[PDB]
Design a protein around this ligand. Structure first.
Ligand SMILES: Nc1nc(N)c2ccsc2n1
Length: 134
C-alpha cells in the first residue's frame, strides 16, 4: 500500500461550482469556457512505482499527465495553455501548481468521504469540482 492509494480509480464529475469564473480568471476565452463548462469529465488515476498518471477524458478533450511528486514537468492543459507543473503531496492532499506567462494557479485534489474533491484557485477565485467513483 502506498502514497496515493485512496486516489486510484475511475472518477466521474458530479457537481461544479464557480468554474466559469475560475476559467475567466485563468484567461480562458469565451468559446472554450462555454464548451468546456458543459463537460462532465472522467478522471482516471493510477500509480506504477513512483509514477502517478492522471487522465482526464471528456467530450471536449482528452488529457494525460504522468509525473513524480516534487519533479517539475511540461503540461498542455485542456484549454491549451502550455504550463510548467509541479505536484506534491501535502498532508494527504495532492497539490498541483501550474506556471505560465508569469501567472500561477493551484489545483488541490483530496478525498472527502466517498468523493474526490478538486479545488481550483486563481488569485481570489475558487472553483470546487466534486467527483464520485464511476
Ligand atoms: N479532459 C478535460 N479535462 C478537464 N479538467 C476538463 C474541464 C472541462 S472540460 C475538460 N476536459
Amino acid at each position: 500500500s502506498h502514497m496515493c492509494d485512496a486516489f486510484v480509480g475511475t472518477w466521474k464529475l458530479v457537481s461544479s461550482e464557480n468554474f466559469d469564473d475560475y476559467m475567466k480568471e485563468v484567461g480562458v476565452g469565451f468559446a472554450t469556457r462555454k464548451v468546456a463548462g458543459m463537460a462532465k469529465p472522467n478522471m482516471i488515476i493510477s500509480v506504477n512505482g513512483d509514477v502517478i498518471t492522471i487522465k482526464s477524458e471528456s467530450t471536449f478533450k482528452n488529457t494525460e499527465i504522468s509525473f513524480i511528486l516534487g519533479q517539475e514537468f511540461d503540461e498542455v492543459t485542456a484549454d491549451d495553455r502550455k504550463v510548467k507543473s509541479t505536484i506534491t503531496l501535502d498532508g494527504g492532499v495532492l497539490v498541483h501548481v501550474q506556471k505560465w506567462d508569469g501567472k500561477s494557479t493551484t489545483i488541490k485534489r483530496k478525498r472527502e468521504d466517498d468523493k474526490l474533491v478538486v479545488e481550483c484557485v486563481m488569485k481570489g477565485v475558487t472553483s470546487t469540482r466534486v467527483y464520485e467513483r464511476a
